[PDB]
C-alpha cells in the first residue's frame, strides 16, 4: 500500500493529473531492514 | 524523474494521403452492400 500525490499547477490541461508521484517501503538485501524509495507511475497503473 | 517539460506522446498521419486511402476503400465496399448507400464511419464503442 503506497501513498501518492498529483503534480504541479501544470495548467496546459492535457497532462493535468497524469503522472502520480508515489512513495513506499521495499525490502533491502538484509532481511530485517527496510528501504524507502520514491518513484512515479502513469495514471492507468494505480487504483485507490 | 522527468527532465525538461512534459507534453503528450502523439502520432502523425498525413491528411492528404489518409483521405485518398479511405476514398479507395469505400469504393470497394459498394460491391458488398449495394451501390446506393451512404457509408458512415464512427468511433469505438466501449470495453477494456
Amino acid at each position, epitope marked *: 500500500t503506497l501513498q501518492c*500525490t*498529483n*503534480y*504541479a*499547477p*501544470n*495548467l496546459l490541461s492535457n497532462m493535468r493529473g497524469e503522472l502520480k*508521484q508515489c512513495s513506499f517501503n521495499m525490502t533491502t538485501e538484509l532481511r530485517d531492514k527496510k528501504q*524507502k524509495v520514491y518513484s512515479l507511475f502513469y495514471r492507468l497503473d494505480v487504483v485507490q | *524523474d*522527468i*527532465i*525538461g*517539460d*512534459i507534453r503528450m506522446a502523439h502520432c502523425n498521419v498525413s491528411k492528404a494521403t489518409w483521405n485518398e486511402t479511405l476514398g479507395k476503400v469505400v469504393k470497394q465496399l459498394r460491391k458488398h452492400f449495394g451501390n446506393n448507400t451512404i457509408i458512415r464511419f464512427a468511433q469505438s464503442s466501449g470495453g477494456d
Partner: antibody
Amino acid sequence: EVQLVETGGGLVQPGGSLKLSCAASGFTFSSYGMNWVRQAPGKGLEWVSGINSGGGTKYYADSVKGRFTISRDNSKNTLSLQMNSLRAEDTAVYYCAKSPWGQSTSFEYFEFWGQGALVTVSS
Amino acid sequence: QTVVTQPRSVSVSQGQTARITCGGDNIGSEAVQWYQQKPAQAPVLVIYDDSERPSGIPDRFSGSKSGNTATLTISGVEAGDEADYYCQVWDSSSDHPLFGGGTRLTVL
C-alpha cells in the same frame, strides 16, 4: 563543492525596477527547479516565485501575483529574477534555492542555499 | 487562510532534551522540514520527510509526526547549536511552499 554565486543591487527608489542574478558553477544545472524566498529583518520567511526545469510553468505567490517575472536561461548556468513594480517597501533579503526533484511540486524541499541576500531599501 | 502555529522561543538549559512542537490544521499532508539557521549564516536542511536526515548531520536530531501535531526532538546540547527552527509543512490548494513563524532556542 556545490555552491551558488550571486549579484544583486540595492537602494532603488519605489518607482523603478531591479534585476537579480543567481549563478551556479556547481552541479549539473539543467534538471533542478530553483526557487526564491524572502526575509525581512523581522518576522520570518515568506515564499515567492517558483519555476520548473524548463521555464514552462512559473507559478507565483498570492502577494506578488501578476506583478513580476522570472527568467531562466540554461546552457550558461544563469537564473534571472526581475522585480519591476517596487511598491512601498517590504524591505527584505532574498535567497537563492535548489530543489532536488525538478519539474514540479507536492512535496518539495531545499538542499543547498546561496546566502547572497542584498536588500531593497528605497531610502 | 491556513495557519501553522508554533511556540515563540522556547528555551531549556542543559537538560539535554528539547521538544520544539509544531502543528495546526491538517497534518497528514507531509510535515516535512525544520530548517536550522544560525545568525548571519545560510539556512541548512536538517531533517527531510520527518524520518531521515541527509548525509553529514550528527544523530542528535530526530523527528516524529504524531496525530495532528508533529514535533522535532533534539537530545543533547552544544555551545554552537543555539539557533532558529521553523516548519515548512504545507503544500495544498494555493502556493505550495508555506513556512510558518519562528522559534528561538537558547541554552544557559
